[PDB]
Every structure is written in structure tokens, then in C-alpha cells.
């Protein structure tokens, strides 16, 4: 009844719960509105958790090496964004890490407050040689702002000062679409065939379902009393 039919459901391993979903009856394509809305809404006022910070102690600076790296802070901070993770902590935490000896970084291999988990470990993270590799500590936050890095922890050098503006809404790929079905007699009937994906942290069942609320409340937390 104006209604979802959960439809093809294939989270695969996770990242992109390929999830073609359907809401069959949209008299007129107005379904699109929710579609194009949630199109941004589904990844609008979300609360994705992610990085900001980094504690490459020893290399206060942010371009020098830190040897044994086959890949320097430029590529070390490069390999943050890609990390992937989650907490409720709602407040910052840290992981550190002192592997040494010649080593990839089992993305997994990590340092782990509250939930802070390799939502999927095993990311290549960091080459190294037998030489002592060095610690890597850093914030963790929930947020929805991936536009401004300036005046970051540049507000108060907790340590290293170096802080990147993380990007964080799990779903990076998504594909909303509509189709005028039959039942046009009473009124041109249409249906919304749409994908999302997501990083494999939060499937649409906890993302599309959210947003859904998220505005339903917030898009209309009132009948525009006006």
C-alpha cells in the first residue's frame, strides 16, 4: 500500500549492499521527489564516523619521510581517507600501532577504542622495511562535513597538529530511478527502481531507512504551520 517491496537484496560481502529497492505504487512519478530528495537526503544530514587526525610522532612535520616507509606521510595521510570504521563513541578516541619489521599493514592490525573497527580490515595500509616503523595516532569522529580541513585540530595542537578533513557517508555509489508502470486508468501509475550502495559499513536498511526518517521528521517536522 504505497509500499515498499523489499526487493532484490544482495549485501554481497557487505560494501554495496547492492540493493535494488522498490516502492511499487507512485500515482504519477512523484515517487521521484522522494527518490531525487533522498537522492541527496539518503546521504545528506547523516552522521558517518571517520577520521580527522594523525599522530606521526617523530615526524612532527608532514612531508618528511619516516623511514622504512615505502610511502611517506604524503601517502600515509593519503592512506587514511580510505580507512574504514565506526563508533558510537560520539567522542574522539585513538588507535596507535607499533608494528615494526618489514611489514604491510594488515589494515586490521590496529589499535582499537570502543567499536572503532576495520569495518573491513585487510586494506593495504602501509609498507615498511625491517627498520622500526613508528606510531600513528589520530582522532575518530562522527560527522557529515567533508568540505573544510583548515582550522581543524589547528584549533589546539593536541599532538602532530596534522589533521585531514575526512570524507564520510558510507554510501559513495547509489542509483535511484523511476518507471511509469500500468494502472494508469485511475491515474498513470509509476514505480521507483533504485539502488544505493554503501561502503559496507551501513547497508540501506540502516541508511536509506534512516534518511527516510531523517527528513520525514525533518523535511516535515510540522505542517509548515506558517
Amino acid at each position: 500500500q504505497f509500499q515498499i517491496e523489499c526487493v532484490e537484496s544482495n549485501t554481497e560481502e557487505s560494501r554495496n549492499h547492492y540493493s535494488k529497492f522498490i516502492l511499487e505504487p507512485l500515482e504519477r512519478g512523484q515517487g521521484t521527489t522522494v527518490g531525487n530528495a533522498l537522492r541527496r537526503v539518503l546521504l545528506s544530514n547523516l552522521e558517518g564516523t571517520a577520521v580527522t587526525a594523525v599522530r606521526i610522532a617523530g615526524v612532527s612535520h608532514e612531508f618528511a619521510t619516516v623511514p622504512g616507509v615505502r610511502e611517506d606521510v604524503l601517502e600515509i595521510i593519503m592512506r587514511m581517507k580510505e580507512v574504514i570504521l565506526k563508533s558510537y563513541s560520539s567522542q574522539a578516541q585513538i588507535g596507535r600501532l607499533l608494528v615494526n619489521g618489514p611489514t604491510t599493514i594488515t589494515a586490521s592490525h590496529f589499535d582499537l577504542p570502543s567499536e572503532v573497527e576495520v569495518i573491513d580490515p585487510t586494506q593495504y595500509v602501509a609498507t615498511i622495511a625491517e627498520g622500526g616503523k613508528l606510531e600513528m595516532e589520530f582522532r575518530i569522529e562522527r560527522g557529515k562535513g567533508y568540505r573544510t580541513v583548515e582550522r581543524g585540530r589547528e584549533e589546539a595542537t593536541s599532538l602532530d597538529f596534522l589533521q585531514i578533513d575526512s570524507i564520510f557517508m558510507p554510501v559513495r555509489k547509489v542509483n535511484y530511478s523511476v518507471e511509469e508502470v500500468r494502472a494508469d486508468g485511475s491515474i498513470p501509475k509509476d514505480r521507483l527502481l533504485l539502488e544505493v550502495w554503501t561502503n559496507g559499513s551501513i547497508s540501506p536498511q540502516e541508511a536509506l531507512s534512516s534518511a527516510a526518517g531523517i527528513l520525514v521528521d525533518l523535511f516535515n517536522p510540522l505542517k509548515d504551520i506558517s
Binding site: 563508533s87 558510537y88 563513541s89 560520539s90 570502543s114 567499536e115
Partner: protein, 294 residues
């Protein structure tokens, strides 16, 4: 010039209740039941029926209307008074009774009885069903009451899972179990294995197993009283059955004794996520498998 003699006057105007209820204020048995007459002077609605102990007369509908509205009007003026005085009330009822806080949780005791008026915690007598309601609904919210048979979460906190109770017990100089070494049940049973507050979840689950096979609690009193149930141990026909849990005592002083039982007891905090954003009671949850237990 009256609201006190009015407090009981209510009962007087209510279920007739004059002297009965008058004494119930802090005065003579028949003192307010006399003020009614004082108010009958001026009042046109007060009633002192001498042939209708219960049957009303309408003093209520006319000259009570205020009487309640005043009542809560003085009350809530005196209530507001002080209520707006740095009245920091950070109170979150959680669960810590019977086993475990019988013995080894004196830690959370240290942070809820040694601490000052703060993180107020109302853990009273409650089990795992009486807790499943009160506690699982989280008035008390999470616990250390044997898992309400369903739980688990980790975050705002230090995580953790569960802990457990071995197969042994406390008694007395010779309190039945202290008399019959047979850990197989039917040893302290004669002290009718009194149902420390019956059937809790840590109380039952081990009591459930204790007497689920021929063995029987066949208890006498079924009440929630560490003192009393363990106090009447002084009189000595009743005992506790929490297995090798609340025995820090027979473990301490062996006019309370330990010769085992055998029989199952485990405890996973109700970890109410209400205190997986918050630590009075996430502390209670993280504390536990980390602080309450040790």
C-alpha cells in the same frame, strides 16, 4: 491559617476518616477531627455527620476546590523552593543485588556508597523477572542479574560480556549444608532451601538447576531479604543458595561454612544501551567484567 489540619481534613472529608488519619499527621488521635468544627465556623461545606460515618455531605464540592489546588500550590511552591537550588539529580537506577554484589562487586559499592550524592542509583530488591520488567525495561536498566536469557552490545564504555559463579556455597557453623557435605542437593534442603528472594534469575537459574531433579527448595519464607533471610540464619532453619557467590562471609567467618554444592550460575549485564551512550549505568555495565566484579 490552615493546611496541616487540612492534610488529614482531606481524609476526614474523604472516606470520613477523621480521628483515623488525624493521628496520621503528627498530632493527637482526635485533634484534626476537632479542627473540622473550628472550620465548620466560617465553612459552609465542612461535614461532621454524627449519623453517617461514611455517607457524605457536600462540604467537599464547594470548599475543597482550592483545598486541593492550594494543596499542590503550597506543595509545589515549597517543592520549587530547593528544586531550583543547584538541584543536580544525575540518578539512573541499575541492578546489583543477590549474588556478585553479594561478594566481589564491593567495587561498585565503593563507587555508589563511598561516593557522594551523585550518580544516584536505586538498585533495590529485584531479580531477573522482577528485573526483566523493572530492570530489563531499565527503571533499573542493565544489571548484574543472570542474563535475562537475551543480551550483548559493546561502546560508550569499556565493553565486556559476562562472569560466573562456581559450584559451592556458604552456610554456618553447621547450617544444614554445613552439616551435609553432599554437594548433590538434599543437604541444606532441610533448611527449607529458602528462596532468597525467590526465583530471581541468578537466584532461580541456580535454584532451578539445584532443584530441577528430585532435589527441591521446598522453602519456608519466599522474601527479598539478605538480612533476615540470612539474619534468621541466626535462628537457623533458613539459608541462602546463591552458589559460591555471596559467600565472601563463609569464606570469611566460619560460623558460616563452605562444603560444596553441585549448580549452574552465570551473569551477563543487561547492558541496556541506554547506558551504551551513558556511564552511571554504562559504568554499571562496563564496570562489571572490569570493575564491579574485581
Amino acid at each position: 491559617m490552615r493546611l496541616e489540619q487540612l492534610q488529614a481534613f482531606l481524609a476526614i472529608a474523604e472516606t470520613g476518616s477523621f480521628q483515623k488519619a488525624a493521628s496520621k499527621c503528627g498530632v493527637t488521635q482526635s485533634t484534626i477531627s476537632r479542627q473540622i468544627q473550628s472550620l465548620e465556623a466560617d465553612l459552609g461545606l465542612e461535614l461532621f455527620h454524627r449519623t453517617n460515618h461514611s455517607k457524605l455531605t457536600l462540604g467537599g464540592e464547594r470548599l475543597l476546590p482550592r483545598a486541593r489546588k492550594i494543596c499542590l500550590e503550597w506543595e509545589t511552591a515549597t517543592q520549587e523552593l530547593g528544586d531550583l537550588i543547584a538541584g543536580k539529580q544525575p540518578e539512573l537506577c541499575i541492578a546489583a543485588i543477590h549474588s556478585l554484589c553479594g561478594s566481589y562487586l564491593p567495587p561498585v559499592l565503593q563507587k555508589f556508597c563511598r561516593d557522594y550524592p551523585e550518580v544516584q542509583l536505586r538498585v533495590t530488591s529485584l531479580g531477573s523477572d522482577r528485573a526483566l520488567k523493572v530492570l530489563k525495561d531499565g527503571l533499573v536498566d542493565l544489571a548484574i542479574v543472570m542474563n535475562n536469557r537475551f543480551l550483548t552490545t559493546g561502546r560508550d564504555m569499556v565493553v565486556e560480556v559476562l562472569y560466573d559463579e562456581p559450584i559451592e556455597l556458604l552456610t554456618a557453623a553447621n547450617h544444614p549444608l554445613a552439616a551435609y557435605e553432599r554437594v548433590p542437593w538434599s543437604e541444606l534442603v532441610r533448611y527449607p532451601q529458602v528462596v532468597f528472594k525467590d526465583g530471581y534469575g541468578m537466584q532461580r537459574l541456580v535454584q532451578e538447576k539445584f532443584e530441577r531433579l528430585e532435589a527441591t527448595l521446598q522453602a519456608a519464607l519466599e522474601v527479598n531479604t539478605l538480612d533476615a533471610f540470612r539474619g534468621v540464619v541466626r535462628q537457623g532453619e533458613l539459608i541462602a543458595l546463591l552458589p559460591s557467590s555471596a559467600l565472601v562471609e563463609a569464606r570469611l567467618d566460619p560460623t558460616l561454612a563452605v562444603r560444596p554444592l553441585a549448580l549452574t550460575r552465570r551473569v551477563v549485564m543487561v547492558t541496556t544501551q541506554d547506558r551504551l551512550q551513558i556511564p552511571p549505568i554504562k559504568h554499571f555495565w562496563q564496570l562489571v567484567r572490569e570493575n564491579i566484579p574485581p
